[PDB]
Amino acid sequence: EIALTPQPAHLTVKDGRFEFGNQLKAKVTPYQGDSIRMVFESFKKELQEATGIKVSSTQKEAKARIILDLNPQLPAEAYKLNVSKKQVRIEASRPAGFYYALQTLKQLMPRNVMAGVATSDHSQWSLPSVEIEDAPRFEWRGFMLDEGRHFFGKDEIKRVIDMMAIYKMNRFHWHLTEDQGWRIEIKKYPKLTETGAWRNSKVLAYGDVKPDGERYGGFYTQKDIKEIVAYAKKKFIEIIPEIDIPGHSQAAVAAYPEFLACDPRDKHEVWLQQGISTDVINVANPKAMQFAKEVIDELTELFPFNYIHLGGDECPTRKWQKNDECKKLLSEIGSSNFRDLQIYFYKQLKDYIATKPADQQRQLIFWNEVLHGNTSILGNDITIMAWIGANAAAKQAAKQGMNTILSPQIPYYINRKQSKLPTEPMSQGHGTETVEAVYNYQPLKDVDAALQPYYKGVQANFWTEWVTEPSVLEYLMLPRLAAVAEAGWTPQEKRNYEDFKERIRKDAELYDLKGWNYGKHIM
């Protein structure tokens, strides 16, 4: 009957049910300039769409069948939800807490409510009596989509946001730039999208698959970006842009080779292959430095969240070793290790950001390869996204006083096959990254108590070398996304895969109402 995902920290089931009727009154705290009333108004619209129930306002506790009260002692995303025959009572300290209480309230109702779809026939509406106290284990509960390899577009990304929101995920990491495409309009550099957002193959070549000649691509205008940011904010999802530099930058190099290429006399094209490119940005070129500053400036206007991801994964130094500007810069920073140029490039950008007014400053996230360099100049107010040797990298980050986010390739890359069946779509892996394998990863296993404060959370990543169509994206995303969401939210002691399996089965109905694809193996 009751199926909540993520499982709350504390749930007690009580006798009886709360019945709505067609109309009822709510009393809602005015905290923070009526912000909670605004959250509640959004909820009311959803509820009416799905059920026909109308909620009006009251100031009188005695008339309130739903009450949202401020409890400042609760954590920033925590809530209490008490459902009795007489009243629904919610307590929280911050808008996100109240929003999550209402997510859990929706999830206690038939699945059409969470889906935001009315039922064909006439229905009766109620809640089970419960006492819930809930709070997320981790503050960062993320999903990353690669749109550089294949582009999905606004409608599909809204569906991604919708999926994340079901499971209380709060961080969308937008991997917008790659060797094979650049997907975000930058006004000062129009060729990033004019050249970089189109290429002459849909498939990315690998093994026996060759380029297919199709004029393929797409990008987001700044208007598009602002729309998606606003859409996600309504669901308490913040967006982190990733401009992956100076590696994974062949599309940018193809757009502006005259100053971004290490070897501008050679040819530079958007890459049609899968793999790791050596065609990295010439970090020693002054126009490359200005380019990066100017891109960051435009990101700052589009993305209000306080973090930017600069990537830094899989960045070969060989083209720097062969470039005169780079050799000279390395000599001038007193080094014989070309990796240091990557760190210096970042230091310039970090310094630049520090010159800006406080509200324009951003904190930086990097893939963990950056930690292999001498990062001392960057200080410890950077964040390491741990993916390769993740457990060890996160521990090293924490030991250096850096925040860390866990996105281990195994098992949190949910583009990978989720079954060994021969009928699975083509993607990376053998089929070992089953729902169970995802759920069973324990992020803080054997992590010393003193390091744990630096572990900000977890993220599932979705790489799109092989994935070109929304149906396949969704098939691979779901239901593994929910396992990572639960890992991010639910206390480890309350996590149980067989229990999760029973609960997630109830969401097939939700997925079907929304027309989402999903793997059916555990269903």
Query: Could you give the residue numbers annotated as active site?
Result: 314
Stretch that binds Cl ion, among 123-131, 363-371, 485-493, 501-509 (CB under 5 A): 485-493
Closest approach of Cβ 488 to Cl ion, in Å? Answer: 11
Cα(459)–Cα(318) distance, integer angstroms = 31
Stretch that binds Cl ion, among 232-240, 284-292, 369-377, 441-449 (CB under 5 A): 441-449
What tokens appear for 437 in the block?
């394998």
Closest approach of Cβ 394 to Cl ion, in Å? Answer: 12
Closest approach of Cβ 460 to Cl ion, in Å? Answer: 16
Instruction: Please report the DSSP string for 192-206 in residue order.
Output: HHHTTTEES-SSPBB
Given the complex with Cl ion, which of 340 and 486 has the nearer CB atom? 486
Q: Choose among 473, 463, 480, 494: nearest CA to 522.
A: 480
What residues contact 157, with CB distance under 8 A and at least 6 apart? 145, 147, 228
Closest approach of Cβ 463 to Cl ion, in Å? Answer: 24
Interhelix angle 31-51/95-107, rounded to 10 degrees, is 20
Contact between 11 and Cl ion (CB under 5 A)?
no
Given the complex with Cl ion, which of 97 and 443 has the nearer CB atom? 443
Q: Choose among 443, 428, 523, 455: nearest CA to 484.
A: 443
Closest approach of Cβ 487 to Cl ion, in Å? Answer: 8
Stretch that binds Cl ion, among 43-51, 141-149, 435-443, 498-506 (CB under 5 A): 435-443
Given the complex with Cl ion, which of 306 and 442 has the nearer CB atom? 442
Cα(159)–Cα(124) distance, integer angstroms = 28
Stretch that binds Cl ion, among 358-366, 424-432, 434-442, 467-475 (CB under 5 A): 434-442
Contact between 471 and Cl ion (CB under 5 A)?
no
Per DSSP, the three-state class of 114 is helix
Given the complex with Cl ion, which of 290 and 442 has the nearer CB atom? 442
Binding mask of the shown chain, residues 490 to 519, with x at each position contacting Cl ion by CB under 5 A: --x---------------------------
What tokens appear for 346 in the block?
């970042």
Site size toward Cl ion, by CB under 5 A: 4
What residues contact 141, with CB distance under 8 A and at least 6 apart? 168, 169, 170, 171, 457, 458, 459, 484, 485, 488, 489
Closest approach of Cβ 126 to Cl ion, in Å? Answer: 36
Closest approach of Cβ 497 to Cl ion, in Å? Answer: 13
Stretch that binds Cl ion, among 101-109, 234-242, 332-340, 488-496 (CB under 5 A): 488-496
The tokens 């993607």 sit on which residue? 427
Cα(189)–Cα(192) distance, integer angstroms = 6
Closest approach of Cβ 380 to Cl ion, in Å? Answer: 24
Given the complex with Cl ion, which of 298 and 486 has the nearer CB atom? 486
Q: What is the signed CA dihedral for 490, 492, 494, 497, rounded to 10 degrees? A: 90
Cα three-residue angle 48-127-77, rounded to 5 degrees: 80
Reduced DSSP (H G I as helix, E B as strand, rest coil) percent helix, strand, coil of the chain, to 5:
40, 20, 45
Sign, Cα dihedral of 90, 94, 99, 100: negative
Stretch that binds Cl ion, among 102-110, 197-205, 437-445, 471-479 (CB under 5 A): 437-445
Q: What is the signed CA dihedral for 249, 425, 471, 502, rounded to 10 degrees? A: -110
Stretch that binds Cl ion, among 55-63, 223-231, 240-248, 440-448 (CB under 5 A): 440-448
Closest approach of Cβ 451 to Cl ion, in Å? Answer: 13
Q: How long a stretch of residues is the chain?
A: 523
Given the complex with Cl ion, which of 204 and 435 has the nearer CB atom? 435
What tokens appear for 409 in the block?
């390739």
Sign, Cα dihedral of 169, 38, 103, 28: positive
Given the complex with Cl ion, which of 119 and 442 has the nearer CB atom? 442
Closest approach of Cβ 444 to Cl ion, in Å? Answer: 4
Contact between 444 and Cl ion (CB under 5 A)?
yes
Cα three-residue angle 488-489-491, rounded to 5 degrees: 100
Given the complex with Cl ion, which of 196 and 443 has the nearer CB atom? 443
Contact 459, 144 (CB under 8 A): yes
Q: Choose among 342, 172, 146, 142: nearest CA to 251.
A: 146
Cα(326)–Cα(61) distance, integer angstroms = 69
Given the complex with Cl ion, which of 432 and 492 has the nearer CB atom? 492
Q: Which of 442, 452, 471, 496 binds Cl ion (CB under 5 A)?
A: 442
Given the complex with Cl ion, which of 53 and 444 has the nearer CB atom? 444
Contact 476, 447 (CB under 8 A): no
Q: Give residues preceding each break in the chain, C–N over 2.5 A.
A: none
Residue nearest to Cl ion (CB): 442
Q: Which residues bind Cl ion (CB under 5 A)?
A: 442-444, 492
